[PDB]
Design goal:
The structure is a homodimer. Chain A is built from six helices and five strands; from the N terminus they run βββαβααβααα. Chain A has about 150 residues and is of the alpha/beta class. The first copy, chain A, has one domain (about 1-145): Nucleotidyltransferase, domain 5 (2-Layer Sandwich). A five-stranded mixed sheet of chain A has the order 3-2-1-4-5, with helices on both faces. In chain A, strand 2 and strand 3 (about 30-35) form a beta hairpin. The longest helix of chain A has 14 residues, at about 40-50. Chain A is globular. The interface of A and B includes residues 43 and 47 of A. Chain A: This is Integrase. Chain A: It is found in: Virion; Host nucleus; Host cytoplasm.
């Protein structure tokens, strides 16, 4: 597994679009409800992600928002390589599970999505000891920068 | 400085409101143009921040968006100590003001590179976090934050 590789995909709940990013080596994720499944919204999400982590390569499917000119330009500007494969998902189902679990804890889906991301990244296997995904990513990136 | 301390402020540019968080120990920042200066938008930003980093304390002023019920509940849910008082006995008040000045400087520099202010702000954040002192060697704020936090996991 490489420290700079991420997988990106869009999922759906309550007629809303959720953009999900998974740092493949750690299982860490970031997700957000976007107003429309456009290239512009996807490009905006990528720039945000690239600004906080050393993103070297992003794997995505061939959807129009992902193959868009704006996303291509954002990747060029940010120094990110895009990979598409032949024309992660084990995380979209997991995130949807946690979102179901905490859905009644907030009024809007967007808030519940963030609570679910927090829960996912802070969770320890069997809830006792070990590292969380949030701890695995800073450790992998930190040991890599030196 | 402690690995879990952040300062969060609200600034205005081109009539838009930008929320900025600075990880005091490293200089790393996260910023975003939010649609309205409300407790709801502030809380949403905080929950996002809290899910990616081990945020223990966030310093804010007493503006109505920061003292809103929704922000207090967000901090409570996330286990964040919200401090309205002047920063934790240091002199991190100078560093905390330099980033907001410095970020606005970078926003003016790249403003022509994208159509919308929101995109420019993200480009400025990227530049700020990736930037090396004098552009040669050393650590960037992005590397300092992950190193501080990783070494604190033990």
């Amino acid at each position: 597994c490489s420290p700079g590789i991420w997988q990106l995909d869009c999922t759906h709940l309550e007629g809303k679009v959720i953009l999900v990013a998974v740092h493949v080596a750690s299982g860490y994720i970031e997700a957000e409800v976007i107003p429309a499944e456009t290239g512009q919204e996807t490009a905006y999400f990528l720039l945000k992600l690239a600004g906080r982590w050393p993103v070297k390569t992003v794997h995505t499917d061939n959807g129009s928002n992902f193959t868009s000119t704006t996303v291509k330009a954002a990747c060029e500007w940010a120094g990110i390589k895009q990979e598409f494969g032949i024309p992660i998902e084990s995380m979209n189902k997991e995130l949807k599970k946690i979102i179901g679990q905490v859905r009644d804890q907030a009024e809007h889906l967007k808030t519940a999505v963030q609570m679910a991301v927090f829960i996912h990244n802070k969770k320890r296997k069997g809830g006792i000891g070990g590292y969380s995904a949030g701890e695995r990513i800073v450790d992998i990136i930190a040991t890599d920068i030196q």
